[PDB]
Amino acid sequence: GQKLPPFSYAYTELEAIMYALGVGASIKDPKDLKFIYEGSSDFSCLPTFGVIIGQKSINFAKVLHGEQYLELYKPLPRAGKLKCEAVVADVVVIIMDVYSYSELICHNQFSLFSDKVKVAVAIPNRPPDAVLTDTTSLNQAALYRLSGDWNPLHIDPNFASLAGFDKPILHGLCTFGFSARRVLQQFADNDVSRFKAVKARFAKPVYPGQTLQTEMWKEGNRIHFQTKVQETGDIVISNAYVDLA
Amino acid sequence: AIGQKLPPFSYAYTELEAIMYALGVGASIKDPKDLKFIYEGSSDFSCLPTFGVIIGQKSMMVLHGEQYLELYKPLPRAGKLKCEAVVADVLVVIIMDVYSYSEKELICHNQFSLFLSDKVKVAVAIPNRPPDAVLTDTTSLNQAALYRLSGDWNPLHIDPNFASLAGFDKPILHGLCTFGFSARRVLQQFADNDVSRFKAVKARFAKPVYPGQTLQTEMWKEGNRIHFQTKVQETGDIVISNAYVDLA
């Protein structure tokens, strides 16, 4: 349970918009102007941007991102500075909680590959209430990486092959951003404030250019979701959900 | 204030800002050769020549009528630069030269022709014969939304309101972005993506481009000068004229 070195994170609307673009937002949909244009009176930072805030963090190359959990105690500001504190919470597989403060704002629990775990959840046994599709760009990874995760695994061909992939793969957290972004607009009216928390488990890989399929089930204030790749039908994100208000 | 120098400023950047520019200007990993401008890990990693337009642009950040950039030395994959602006002359048109140094050494020179001399970098007419080559580029519906992250936040390129109220059907793409595209193509078509051979470019802006439209860069090789013109395959309108780029 060693309490890791504290780091800080600061960002402006820029880093925010950059995340939004790299995660799917498009001005093709007027409602998305809210996440892409700082001038919008409605301008908000996407909830999952918090994953990037606490993301500043053995053989790292031998590590696999298994699950992710984010909870927003308060809507993320359109810009700002934050103090973060990473604390290993449990343990092969290591679960590490990381809290980010401003004046507590958000909590991240990275399950890098117990009772201190934020468990994933099985999806309802019935056809989905709604399923939206998203077309990934051939450069999705090239753009999303600009938000912090520079792992060559997502852009370097040879690096990906030695790693075992036909071609570089899209960041797990990017697909995550996509689906989370869709749940936000489908069951919460793009109301950033109603986005309380999300939990997701990563499964099969996604390749830049493929098409995401986010399946959603509304069960009260919890929107269960699963993500696939309409093309292979593989499940890339499972037993996930997002709690709303 | 015909010959008045303006307050000196400085621009610093890393591979990030560079890659961000490249993406917003067209580079795509769909083409392996572009990995050179998108991946900092590439052993070949280079910063696109026209990125210099962003280095000396930080001054402005009226009509932007023409643009001229000369690279005295290949732009570094990152770095800090000191810039000095100066109203080269006034014609109403106002010509503003801005030089960027990296310590006492001069790196690039920008000449922004703002609309509203013997000291101006003249545009040049294209050869009177069919183009030697013409490559097309498909603009994204968010091209402007991404390119603006490189500094020019003018609402004209993204807010539907400001757009119209200025005389535009809908937001328009930055002139310098179309510029980046064509310049990028010339670089890969007649200089083998060899950033070092890209000496200077001159271009005149014409009709608007809307995010999503398809660019058509027409090129004529005349020795070491590649003349070019840019259109919008859809309307056939000329968006960049009498332009060129000198190669070494």
Together in a domain, B128 and B90: no
DSSP classification of residue B34? G
B248 Cβ under 8 Å from any chain A Cβ: no
CA distances to A143, A167, B143 from A138, in Å: 10, 11, 15
CB contact under 8 A, B23 and A156: no
Whether B93 and B127 map to the same domain: the answer is: no
Q: Same domain, yes or no, for B110 and B220?
A: no
DSSP A187: H
User: What is the per-residue DSSP string for A193-221?
Assistant: GGEEEEEEEE-S---TT-EEEEEEEEETT
Pairing of strands A7-11, A80-88: antiparallel
Identify the experimental approach: X-ray
Would you call B38 and A139 a contact, using CB atoms and an 8 Å cutoff?
yes
Residue B64's DSSP bridge partners are: B114
Residue by residue, DSSP assigns B45-80 as ----GGGHHHHTGGGT--EEEEEEEEESSPPPSSEE
- DSSP string for B161-200: HHHHTTT-SS----HHHHHHHHHHHHHHHHSTT-GGGEEE
Phi (first) and psi of residue B244, to 5 degrees? -165, 170
Q: How, if at all, do strands A195-202 and A234-244 pair? A: antiparallel
Q: What does residue B183 show for φ and ψ, rounded to 5 degrees?
A: -60, -40
Range of the domain at A180: 120-245
Q: How many folded domains does chain A comprise?
A: 2
Interface of B with A in 180-219 (CB under 8 A): 211
Domain boundary among A98, A119, A140: A119
Residue A202, annotated ligand binder? yes
What are the b/e assignments for B125-146, b being 16+ CB within 10 Å? Answer: ebeeeebeebbebebbebbbbb
Of A21, A30, A150, the CB nearest to B146: A21
- The one-letter code for the residue type at B193 is N
B65 annotated among ligand-binding-site residues: yes
Nearest by Cα to A197 from A69, A89, A94, A96: A69
Please judge whether A27 and B141 are an interchain contact, meaning their C-beta atoms are less than 8 angstroms apart.
yes
Q: What CATH number should be reported for the domain holding residue B192? A: 3.10.129.10
Q: Which residue type does A116 have? A: K
Q: Tokens 């009260």 belong to which residue? A: A220
With CA atoms as reference, the chain B residue closest to A41 would be: B159
Give B-chain residues touching A14 at CB under 8 angstroms. Answer: 149
Contact B38 A14 (CB under 8 A): no
Angle at which helices B15-24 and B175-190 cross, to 10°: 90
Phi, psi of A121 (to 5 degrees): -135, 135
| Pick from B38, B160, B211: CB nearest A142 | B38
Q: Does A41 touch chain B (CB under 8 A)?
A: no
Instruction: Copy the structure tokens of residue B194.
Output: 């060899």
**Token pair in block for residue B193:** 């993506």
- At A34, is the secondary structure helix, strand, or coil? helix
One domain for residues A155 and A227: yes
Cα(B209)–Cα(A28) distance, rounded to whole angstroms?
Answer: 16
For residue B38, give every residue at least 6 positions away whose Cβ sits within 8 Å of its Cβ, in sequence order, or none. A139, A142, A155, B19, B22, B23, B27, B28, B29
Q: Which of A105, A169, A223, A237 is catalytic?
A: A169
Where is A177: in which H helix or E strand? helix A172-187
Token pair in block for residue A237: 């994100």
Smallest CA–CA distance from B43 into chain A, residue? A156
> What DSSP designation does B8 have?
P
- Whether residue B247 is annotated as binding a ligand: the answer is no
Which structure tokens are listed for B199?
A: 């000496």
C-beta atoms of B158 and A14 within 8 A? no
Dist. CA B186–CA B166, nearest whole Å: 32
In three-state secondary structure terms, A225 is strand
| Domain boundary residue, one of A119, A145, A178 | A119
Chain A residues inside the 8 Å CB shell of B24: none
**B187: β partners:** none
Cβ separation of B29 and A208 shorter than 8 Å?
A: yes
Q: Which residue has the tokens 């970098």?
A: B121
Query: Are B145 and A36 an interchain contact pair (Cβ–Cβ within 8 Å)?
Result: yes
- Rounded to whole angstroms, how far apart are CA atoms A8 and A83? 4
Burial of B73 by CB count in 10 Å (0-12 exposed, 13-18 middle, 19+ buried)?
Answer: exposed
Interface check for B116 against chain A (CB to CB < 8 A): the answer is no
Q: Give yes or no: residues B165 and B235 share one domain.
A: yes
Is A21–B159 a contact, with Cβ atoms under 8 angstroms apart? no
3-state class (DSSP) for residue B148: helix
Answer yes or no: do A39 and A56 share one domain.
Answer: yes
CB B102 within 8 A of CB B80: yes
B131, amino acid identity: P
Residues A95 and A130 in one domain: no
One-letter amino acid of B195: V
- Asked if A76 and A49 touch (Cβ cutoff 8 Å), the reply is yes
- Which candidate in B13, B29, B143, B210 is best for mutational testing of the A interface (most A CBs within 10 A)? B29
8 A C-beta contact, residue B174 and residue B24 = no
Q: Which two tokens stand for residue A51?
A: 């994953």
Whether residue B230 contacts residue B240, with contact meaning beta carbons closer than 8 Å, is answered with yes
Whole-angstrom Cα Rg for chain A:
17
3-state secondary structure of A146: helix
Can you tell me which residue has the tokens 């852009």?
A155
Size of interface A-B (CB pairs under 8 A): 68
One domain, residues B115 and B138? no
Could you say which residues from 51 to 110 on chain B have a Cβ atom under 8 Å away from some Cβ of chain A?
none
* Contact status of A162 with chain B (Cβ, < 8 Å): no
Tell me how close the Cα of A219 comes to any Cα of chain B, in angstroms.
34
Closest residue in chain A to residue B37, using alpha carbons only: A142
B97/chain A closest Cα distance in angstroms:
28
Concerning whether A54 is annotated as a catalytic residue, the answer is no
Residues of B in contact with A30 (CB under 8 A): 160
Q: Are B190 and B183 in contact (CB under 8 A)?
A: no
The reply to whether A102 and A153 lie within a common domain is no
Same domain, residue pair A48 and A112: yes
Closest CA to B29 of A145, A163, A227: A145
Q: Among A99, A119, A139, where does a domain finish?
A: A119
Q: B153 and B60 in contact (C-beta within 8 Å)?
A: no
- Residues whose CB is less than 8 angstroms from the CB of residue B24 and which lie 6 or more positions away in sequence, other chains included: B143, B146, B147, B148, B149, B150, B177, B180
Is A142–B23 a contact, with Cβ atoms under 8 angstroms apart?
A: yes
Kindly give the pairing relationship between strand A106-112 and strand A94-101: antiparallel
Residues B114 and B129 in one domain: no
Strands (E), A60-194: 65-72, 80-88, 94-101, 106-112, 130-135
Residues A171 and A205 in one domain: yes
Report the C-alpha gap between B38 and B195 in whole angstroms: 14
How many CB atoms are located within 10 Å of the residue A143 CB? 23
- Torsional sign, CA A200, A206, A212, A213: negative
Question: Cα(A176)–Cα(A201) distance, rounded to whole angstroms?
Answer: 9
Contact list in B for residue A43 (CB cut-off 8 A) is none
Q: Is A97 among the annotated ligand-binding positions? A: no
CA dist list (Å): B193 to A4, B186, B208:
45, 9, 27
CB atoms within 10 A of CB A41: 6
